[PDB]
Amino acid sequence: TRPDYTSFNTVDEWLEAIKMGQYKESFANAGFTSFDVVSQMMMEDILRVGVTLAGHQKKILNSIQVMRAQMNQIQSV
Amino acid sequence: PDYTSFNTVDEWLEAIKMGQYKESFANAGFTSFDVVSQMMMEDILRVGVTLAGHQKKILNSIQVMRAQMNQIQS
Amino acid sequence: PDYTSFNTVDEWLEAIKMGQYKESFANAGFTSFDVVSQMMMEDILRVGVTLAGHQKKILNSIQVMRAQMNQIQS
Amino acid sequence: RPDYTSFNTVDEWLEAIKMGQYKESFANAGFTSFDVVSQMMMEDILRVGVTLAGHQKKILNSIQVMRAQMNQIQS
Numbered sequence A: 001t002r003p004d005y006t007s008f009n010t011v012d013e014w015l016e017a018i019k020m021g022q023y024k025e026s027f028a029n030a031g032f033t034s035f036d037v038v039s040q041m042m043m044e045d046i047l048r049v050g051v052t053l054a055g056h057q058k059k060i061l062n063s064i065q066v067m068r069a070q071m072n073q074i075q076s077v
Numbered sequence B, C: 001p002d003y004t005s006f007n008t009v010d011e012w013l014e015a016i017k018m019g020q021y022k023e024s025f026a027n028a029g030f031t032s033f034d035v036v037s038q039m040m041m042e043d044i045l046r047v048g049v050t051l052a053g054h055q056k057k058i059l060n061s062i063q064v065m066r067a068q069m070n071q072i073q074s
Numbered sequence D: 001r002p003d004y005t006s007f008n009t010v011d012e013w014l015e016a017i018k019m020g021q022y023k024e025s026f027a028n029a030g031f032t033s034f035d036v037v038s039q040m041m042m043e044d045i046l047r048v049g050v051t052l053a054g055h056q057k058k059i060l061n062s063i064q065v066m067r068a069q070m071n072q073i074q075s
Helices: A011-017 A021-029 A043-049 A054-075 B009-015 B019-028 B041-046 B052-072 C009-015 C019-027 C041-046 C052-073 D010-016 D020-028 D042-048 D053-073
Strands: none
Touching: A011 A021, A021 A043, A043 A054, A043 C052, A054 C041, A054 C052, B009 B019, B041 B052, C009 C019, C041 C052, D010 D020, D020 D042, D042 D053
16 A cells, blocks of 8 residues: 555665665665664675675665664664 | 664654654554555544644655655656 | 684683673573674674774774685685 | 674785785685685695795795794694
């Protein structure tokens, strides 16, 4: 019935935010549609999605690491 | 840069700090975002939310959810 | 000038001086770097690490382990 | 899963002593963790392909310092 809702901001908004918007469609097609699943990505998943440039992998891996720290912060609730 | 995410109505309630109403939502049958996105004040009163501040918080969070769903469909 | 090799989850805990949690990890099923590299704070708490200093040490060490796995996959 | 056996890789060790041209020779021979590199002797450095005297010396004095460092942490 309605669009999935899993976070206040969308994965797309995040990719646009860090200037990685060129990967929106790659990420979606591959099912990495929520921060919950993006926060578990490793280099091999980013490669599979199609991020081959080192600078872009570093940027996306850095955001994934911030997502995990923020999640670990809340969990220490 | 807020990466807060949730997979269920319970976690969404904990994310907007309204976790005290988890069981009342679940008991009344509000278990999916499909239905939570359509809730009005009457439903909010039906599950026991009586503080004005909590009622606004939950309704504004429903409105924010609807806006997100509505861009998506766009 | 740090040549800390280690082949087991137990050896890694001892290397980072968190040997006191060796059994806890084991009894909860955290027996391979493959699952340890995926641990979050809920897992750290499940294996009984309550001190904030230990929690940070372990999580940062996991953060460092993932980065190395990520390089190698590069 | 890229098997984790240290906070540092043998590869970074080799680059640090400017012996990086031997990275893949070390990897192929399975000299991929420090506890194994710390046990290499001249015959292992030769099997790997290091033939220049200066490089053998650099790599062996380095392995010697590594053992001295492991032997202290062991005390």
